[PDB]
Design a protein around this motif. Structure first.
Motif, mmCIF file in Angstrom:
data_model
loop_
_atom_site.group_PDB
_atom_site.id
_atom_site.type_symbol
_atom_site.label_atom_id
_atom_site.label_comp_id
_atom_site.label_asym_id
_atom_site.label_seq_id
_atom_site.Cartn_x
_atom_site.Cartn_y
_atom_site.Cartn_z
ATOM 1 N N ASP A 74 -2.467 85.157 -71.436
ATOM 2 C CA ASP A 74 -4.064 84.780 -71.278
ATOM 3 C C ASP A 74 -4.148 83.455 -71.049
ATOM 4 O OD1 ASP A 74 -2.790 84.426 -74.061
ATOM 5 O OD2 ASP A 74 -4.733 83.562 -74.543
ATOM 6 N N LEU A 75 -3.368 82.513 -71.212
ATOM 7 C CA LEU A 75 -3.277 81.180 -70.841
ATOM 8 C C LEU A 75 -3.408 80.716 -69.324
ATOM 9 C CD1 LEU A 75 -1.733 79.457 -74.115
ATOM 10 C CD2 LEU A 75 -3.984 79.947 -73.766
ATOM 11 N N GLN A 76 -4.365 80.270 -68.656
ATOM 12 C CA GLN A 76 -4.052 80.127 -67.332
ATOM 13 C C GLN A 76 -4.435 78.564 -67.042
ATOM 14 O OE1 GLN A 76 -7.301 82.557 -66.883
ATOM 15 N NE2 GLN A 76 -6.221 84.141 -65.552
ATOM 16 N N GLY A 77 -3.461 78.285 -65.934
ATOM 17 C CA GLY A 77 -3.670 76.646 -65.495
ATOM 18 C C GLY A 77 -2.743 75.943 -66.505
ATOM 19 N N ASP A 78 -2.886 74.706 -66.775
ATOM 20 C CA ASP A 78 -2.132 73.602 -67.283
ATOM 21 C C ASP A 78 -2.938 73.103 -68.486
ATOM 22 O OD1 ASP A 78 -3.593 71.934 -66.162
ATOM 23 O OD2 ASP A 78 -1.829 70.748 -65.277
ATOM 24 N N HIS B 102 -2.161 73.224 -71.762
ATOM 25 C CA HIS B 102 -2.172 73.820 -72.874
ATOM 26 C C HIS B 102 -1.024 73.426 -74.061
ATOM 27 C CE1 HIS B 102 -4.656 77.082 -71.236
ATOM 28 N NE2 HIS B 102 -3.703 76.808 -70.009
ATOM 29 N N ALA B 103 -1.448 73.613 -75.415
ATOM 30 C CA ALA B 103 -0.441 73.312 -76.330
ATOM 31 C C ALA B 103 -0.477 74.353 -77.259
ATOM 32 C CB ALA B 103 -0.843 71.955 -77.386
ATOM 33 N N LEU B 104 0.773 75.158 -77.760
ATOM 34 C CA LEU B 104 0.787 75.988 -78.725
ATOM 35 C C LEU B 104 1.271 75.566 -79.815
ATOM 36 C CD1 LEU B 104 2.848 78.513 -76.530
ATOM 37 C CD2 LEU B 104 0.317 78.237 -76.658
ATOM 38 N N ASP B 105 0.638 75.988 -81.141
ATOM 39 C CA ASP B 105 0.970 75.878 -82.322
ATOM 40 C C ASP B 105 1.478 77.115 -82.984
ATOM 41 O OD1 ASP B 105 -1.150 77.038 -83.253
ATOM 42 O OD2 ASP B 105 -2.353 75.167 -83.642
ATOM 43 N N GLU B 106 1.538 77.053 -84.290
ATOM 44 C CA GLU B 106 2.029 78.192 -85.274
ATOM 45 C C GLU B 106 1.051 79.437 -85.256
ATOM 46 O OE1 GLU B 106 2.206 75.106 -86.003
ATOM 47 O OE2 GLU B 106 4.617 74.657 -86.017
ATOM 48 N N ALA C 13 7.126 76.124 -70.069
ATOM 49 C CA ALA C 13 7.872 74.792 -70.071
ATOM 50 C C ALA C 13 9.286 75.308 -70.387
ATOM 51 C CB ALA C 13 7.507 73.838 -71.451
ATOM 52 N N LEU C 14 10.320 74.310 -70.346
ATOM 53 C CA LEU C 14 11.658 74.555 -70.574
ATOM 54 C C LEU C 14 11.803 73.514 -72.253
ATOM 55 C CD1 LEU C 14 14.169 75.794 -70.623
ATOM 56 C CD2 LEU C 14 15.127 73.938 -68.882
ATOM 57 N N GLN C 15 11.954 74.043 -73.217
ATOM 58 C CA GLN C 15 11.766 73.407 -74.317
ATOM 59 C C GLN C 15 13.040 73.308 -75.150
ATOM 60 O OE1 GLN C 15 10.696 76.383 -74.429
ATOM 61 N NE2 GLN C 15 8.466 76.450 -73.982
ATOM 62 N N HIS D 92 7.672 79.098 -58.814
ATOM 63 C CA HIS D 92 7.499 79.355 -60.216
ATOM 64 C C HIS D 92 8.243 77.855 -60.825
ATOM 65 C CE1 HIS D 92 6.813 83.468 -60.472
ATOM 66 N NE2 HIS D 92 8.239 83.781 -59.570
ATOM 67 N N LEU D 93 8.908 77.161 -60.017
ATOM 68 C CA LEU D 93 9.553 76.002 -60.656
ATOM 69 C C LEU D 93 8.429 74.986 -60.772
ATOM 70 C CD1 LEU D 93 13.238 75.340 -59.399
ATOM 71 C CD2 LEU D 93 12.194 76.963 -61.227
ATOM 72 N N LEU D 94 7.971 74.397 -62.050
ATOM 73 C CA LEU D 94 6.870 73.545 -62.138
ATOM 74 C C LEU D 94 7.454 72.146 -61.954
ATOM 75 C CD1 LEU D 94 6.101 75.005 -65.738
ATOM 76 C CD2 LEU D 94 4.892 75.513 -63.725
ATOM 77 N N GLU D 95 6.444 71.184 -61.684
ATOM 78 C CA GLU D 95 6.647 69.862 -61.545
ATOM 79 C C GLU D 95 6.472 69.202 -62.727
ATOM 80 O OE1 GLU D 95 4.823 71.746 -59.409
ATOM 81 O OE2 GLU D 95 4.048 70.573 -57.652
ATOM 82 N N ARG D 96 5.804 69.752 -63.658
ATOM 83 C CA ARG D 96 5.627 69.407 -64.980
ATOM 84 C C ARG D 96 5.279 70.538 -66.172
ATOM 85 N NH1 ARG D 96 2.481 67.463 -61.952
ATOM 86 N NH2 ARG D 96 0.416 68.496 -61.921
ATOM 87 N N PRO D 97 5.471 70.455 -67.502
ATOM 88 C CA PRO D 97 5.099 71.467 -68.339
ATOM 89 C C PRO D 97 3.629 71.916 -68.038
ATOM 90 C CG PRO D 97 6.212 69.861 -69.567
ATOM 91 C CD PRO D 97 6.268 69.535 -68.201
ATOM 92 N N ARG D 98 3.371 73.434 -67.940
ATOM 93 C CA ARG D 98 1.812 73.806 -68.076
ATOM 94 C C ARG D 98 1.400 74.161 -69.469
ATOM 95 N NH1 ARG D 98 -0.287 78.815 -67.636
ATOM 96 N NH2 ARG D 98 1.683 79.545 -68.162
ATOM 97 N N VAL D 99 2.343 74.353 -70.266
ATOM 98 C CA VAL D 99 2.087 74.851 -71.437
ATOM 99 C C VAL D 99 3.318 74.248 -72.415
ATOM 100 C CG1 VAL D 99 2.017 76.573 -73.606
ATOM 101 C CG2 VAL D 99 1.077 76.961 -70.954
ATOM 102 N N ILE D 100 2.723 73.333 -73.331
ATOM 103 C CA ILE D 100 3.613 72.613 -74.327
ATOM 104 C C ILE D 100 3.860 73.342 -75.649
ATOM 105 C CG2 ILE D 100 3.922 70.573 -73.065
ATOM 106 C CD1 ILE D 100 2.464 70.555 -76.469
ATOM 107 N N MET D 101 5.043 73.448 -76.433
ATOM 108 C CA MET D 101 5.200 73.699 -77.591
ATOM 109 C C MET D 101 5.029 72.507 -78.529
ATOM 110 S SD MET D 101 5.944 77.168 -78.303
ATOM 111 C CE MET D 101 7.282 77.288 -79.544
ATOM 112 N N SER D 102 4.100 72.500 -79.624
ATOM 113 C CA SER D 102 3.847 71.530 -80.496
ATOM 114 C C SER D 102 4.695 71.716 -81.892
ATOM 115 C CB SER D 102 2.440 71.217 -80.711
ATOM 116 O OG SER D 102 1.868 70.382 -81.726
ATOM 117 N N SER D 103 5.350 70.758 -82.148
ATOM 118 C CA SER D 103 5.829 70.389 -83.583
ATOM 119 C C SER D 103 5.193 69.478 -84.581
ATOM 120 C CB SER D 103 7.304 70.046 -83.367
ATOM 121 O OG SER D 103 8.076 70.059 -84.502
#
Ligand SMILES: NC(=O)c1ccc[n+]([C@@H]2O[C@H](COP(=O)([O-])OP(=O)(O)OC[C@H]3O[C@@H](n4cnc5c(N)ncnc54)[C@H](OP(=O)(O)O)[C@@H]3O)[C@@H](O)[C@H]2O)c1
Length: 338
Positions: free
Chosen positions: A135-139, A141-145, A233-235, A293-304
């Motif tokens: 559902d998340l389009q474009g860049d 974005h940050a994901l949380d729990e 992303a690659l996390q 597909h290969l991103l130049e930078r993360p489009r979605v990040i995982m937030s800790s």
């Protein structure tokens, strides 16, 4: 040592399980661990050495059988549920990955309730339960729990390894409901791809994947590209930070609920360029024919941020720090030829 606090770790031959056992012993716990065949020295030759670091008892159990964990978790103060089915490309994922995952986890938490002594259960799930978010389009974005992988999308489209992602969502939700029903504290950790040396002598898992740009293992390289394509992303996280986070969440009374464990959000291309520069004695591909597909930078990040604001600090914060010792492990495992 009779009054030592005691931790149960399921799957003592596994990559994360073996590292967790070692840390627990180094930090002064007594440990009980389960493996499916304690006579298998190809998988379990490290356990004798770990028994030199502290009190470590080894028990035979298959988590798929109800009550299998009863004896190992009896008397334990903490239960670290690391072992789980990891059948990424099952032909019948509902029966070979999803149902065994849910059933194995409920079996284990049931044993923890039965012991009566377990103050907290720490369940190791995965980021694969967090980041499937079509559902998340474009860049930006940050994901949380509160992000959950889209189970209906996964079952409708069945992209590669979909059954693994689904299994994490369902086992987490079942574990949480069961633990609330029985009034036992359960905290869930969702790590991203985990990198670094461990005691286990015969593992593949994320060591194959995180070393695939150096080894040329196309299956591992496809796992990395898949993570980026499906999650944005690659996390990465270092095994030592994951293990410290698990002990932290066990010990910190105020911790509760679900926690992402992730040090860095990078990309396939950034990681390849980094490894090509750091380890030029391997043939690392860095010129990519788009592969769109290969991103130049993360489009979605995982937030800790949830874990960090609980009071936890990562110690391996750069790519150099995350890759500080995994190459020597890969050589020792034979994943790398030199
Ligand atoms: N490594 C990563 O990057 C990463 C990231 C996020 C989450 N995780 C999760 O962390 C857990 C540990 O995985 P790992 O990376 O350490 O992989 P691993 O080296 O392949 O370890 C898997 C462990 O689970 C055990 N297991 C599987 N089914 C079992 C069963 N029915 N009964 C008892 N034990 C069983 C395995 O024992 P057997 O050898 O007998 O099968 C082994 O000890 C997994 O749940 C994984 O989903 C890993």
């Amino acid at each position: 040592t009779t009054k030592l606090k005691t931790a149960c770790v399921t799957g003592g031959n596994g990559y994360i399980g073996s590292a967790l056992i070692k840390m627990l012993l180094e930090e002064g716990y007594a440990v009980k661990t389960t493996v499916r065949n304690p006579d298998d020295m190809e998988k379990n030759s490290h356990l004798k050495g770990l028994q030199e670091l502290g009190p470590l008892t080894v028990l035979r159990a298959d988590m798929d059988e109800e009550g299998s964990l009863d004896d190992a978790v009896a008397g334990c103060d903490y239960a670290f549920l690391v072992a789980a089915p990891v059948n990424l490309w099952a032909q019948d994922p509902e029966k070979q990955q999803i149902e065994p995952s849910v059933r194995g986890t409920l079996n284990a938490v049931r044993s923890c309730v039965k012991a009566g002594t377990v103050r907290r259960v720490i369940l190791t799930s995965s980021a694969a339960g967090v980041y499937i978010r079509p559902d998340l389009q474009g860049d930006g974005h940050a994901l949380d729990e509160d992000s959950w992988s889209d189970v209906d999308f996964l079952r409708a489209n069945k992209p590669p390894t979909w059954g693994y992602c689904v299994s994490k969502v369902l086992l987490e939700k079942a574990a949480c409901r069961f633990a609330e029903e029985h009034g036992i504290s359960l905290v869930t950790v969702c790590p991203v791809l985990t990198v670094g040396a461990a005691p286990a002598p015969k593992v593949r898992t994320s060591i194959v994947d995180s070393l695939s740009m150096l080894s040329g293992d196309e299956a591992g390289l496809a796992v990395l590209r898949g993570i980026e394509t499906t999650s944005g992303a690659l996390q990465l996280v270092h095994i030592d930070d994951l293990c410290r986070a698990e002990l932290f969440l066990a010990e910190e009374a105020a911790a509760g609920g679900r926690y992402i464990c992730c040090s860095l959000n990078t990309t396939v291309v950034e990681l390849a360029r980094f490894l090509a520069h750091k380890y030029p004695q391997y043939r690392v591909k860095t010129n990519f024919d788009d592969d769109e597909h290969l991103l130049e930078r993360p489009r979605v990040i995982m937030s800790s941020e949830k874990l960090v604001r609980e009071g936890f600090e990562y110690r391996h914060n750069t790519l150099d720090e995350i890759y500080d010792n995994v190459v020597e492990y890969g050589k020792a495992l034979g994943i790398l030829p030199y």
